[PDB]
Symmetry: C3
Subunit: 238 residues, 3 copies
């Protein structure tokens, strides 16, 4: 429904209870994720659903993050979405093909951020509504029962690196977009640069951002020679 | 059958042919693993089975490591266990759901330490008797045909890191306890500290030890802010 | 059909359109991979098929890399192979058990170098014709849409490390040979030494080479003590 590959790699969360920021987010980013989940406080989600209806963005360049499968919030989200022109939703805590299928006929970006989602990543990616896979390090660690996703130097811990590769491979195996996880340390531009360069080098399509200042960094970040090495060179020229 | 989550994170192997050490092991550790497998020489396993019957420990805080599926030793182990109050066994070289199921009605901690076990980790974790997943680096490398699990600096080699993450994710996907592998270099307290801190940070529930001096180390070892980051902070306070 | 484990660990690609080099490749390496795929230009593949028939090597120590499943080149390759004594083929871009099975009654070394192949590695390894698993970092990154498989220091990027471990585990779970990926930087002998030492330490059986100068490097590259640690020591003595 959307030509997401035609849009650039800089995607930006915007909490949907801040409609006064929607235009700025759309001007700053390649794709805006209007957020009904963790970016919006529980008490503000009804107001976010009204803003979703009242302040429209370009549906060719906007995705809506709904709430998790089986929640009453998700039911309210889908009702609010009915009166919009949006076609593509982002499903947080995505944990099964069935959770993706129950969102048909919408296009779905599955955000894997739990152990069950990682174990089921291939089944989630293969589901007919899926158009992209994302991963989320902080909810992954939280639901695992841990306390940090990164070492002292800022490098991802191993289980986070493992899920990152899992999602990239599952997405690419089924022709889906691959979206890399957000860099929560906004002022850590050095770390974001290295992370987005790393993501682009292995074939992520998108780095998702939580602050508009990260979008320029992402956009900029994105012997024997045999056939694949020449493809690497062509990908660079492109 | 056991409230294993209620016990602390410091689990300690004690070879079952050393009953004179059982009381000391129970006083030193949160949970004792009385070992009928690799901790006991082949010729001493019959004596270990008698000690298992004769010198009981608290079954709320003691697990018995039996021998691998299909071995005559495992058959002897289960016969010896019949006359004990233990309910929970640790299955080494765990390689299929069927190996776990044939131990019903016992509770099972599956110790994955072979390639087949890693490939089948999700099926093993989902098996109805499973209450925990552990991994073992040295038997993993041995059965792969290799010669060391760690680099010169003591860091795990990549296939070991891969299986570690595999077991953590499979355990957590099915609500099982996650047990991190033993640190064979007993006097390497620095390495154990970093390893157990790493394990606790990503949500392992337990670090298993092979010497009681490791238990204190383990017990001690265990921007944009969104919902999961606050859960990280709560997990720390707890 | 071949006692591949009896041969040493140094395998060497030789483009099949260079029959004047076949004898030198056989003398330099433990096993020669006569290449009909990426080592030979599209326009030279018919000449490579004739050289395959005309200049035979020892079939106990020679494997033929054919072209990918579903290609017209692969059909031509199998026709050319009919008039040879070779029994074992290497399948590039191996992506399903069905691709391996359609090569029966030949023995197959599946070369996984795409996301779909990584996701399906266990099914590929378990296929009845499979005798080995290899992985390929450059085609993996190319087909993912990325631009490099290695960081600036030459270390593999994470998705490459992930697929490497995936292939080692899948191969070993089903009793197959495990072949480590080629080191394209031929003059980087230091990096190859560390890489092949790493591969041998975790139980790869083979490091595949693209230049004969790499074969000597590969051949040379290949506390509590419990049962598996003694197996590590025995593997070293052997
Ligand atoms: Mg999240
Ligand atoms: Mg073991
Ligand atoms: Mg290739």
């Amino acid at each position: 429904h959307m030509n997401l590959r035609a849009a650039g790699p800089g995607w930006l969360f915007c909490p949907a209870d801040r409609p006064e920021r929607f235009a700025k987010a759309a001007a700053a980013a390649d794709v805006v994720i209007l957020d009904l989940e963790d970016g919006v406080a529980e008490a503000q989600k009804p107001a976010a659903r009204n803003a979703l209806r009242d302040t429209p963005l370009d549906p060719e360049r906007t995705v809506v993050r709904i709430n998790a499968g089986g929640t009453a919030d998700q039911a309210r989200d889908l009702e609010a979405l009915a009166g919009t022109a949006y076609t593509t939703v982002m499903l947080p805590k995505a944990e099964s093909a069935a959770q993706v299928i129950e969102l048909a006929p919408r296009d779905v970006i599955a955000l894997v951020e739990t152990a069950r989602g990682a174990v089921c990543a291939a089944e989630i990616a293969a589901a007919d509504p899926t158009v992209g896979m994302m991963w989320g390090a902080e909810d992954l660690i939280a639901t695992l029962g841990g306390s940090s996703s990164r070492r002292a130097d800022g490098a991802y811990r191993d289980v986070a690196r493992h899920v990152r590769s899992t999602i990239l491979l599952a997405a690419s195996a089924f022709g889906r977009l691959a979206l890399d996880a957000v860099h929560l340390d906004i002022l850590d531009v050095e770390g974001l640069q290295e992370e987005a360069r790393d993501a682009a080098a292995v074939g992520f399509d998108v780095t998702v951002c939580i602050h508009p200042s990260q979008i320029p960094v992402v956009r900029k970040a994105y012997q024997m020679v045999d056939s694949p090495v020449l493809t690497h060179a062509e990908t660079m020229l492109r």
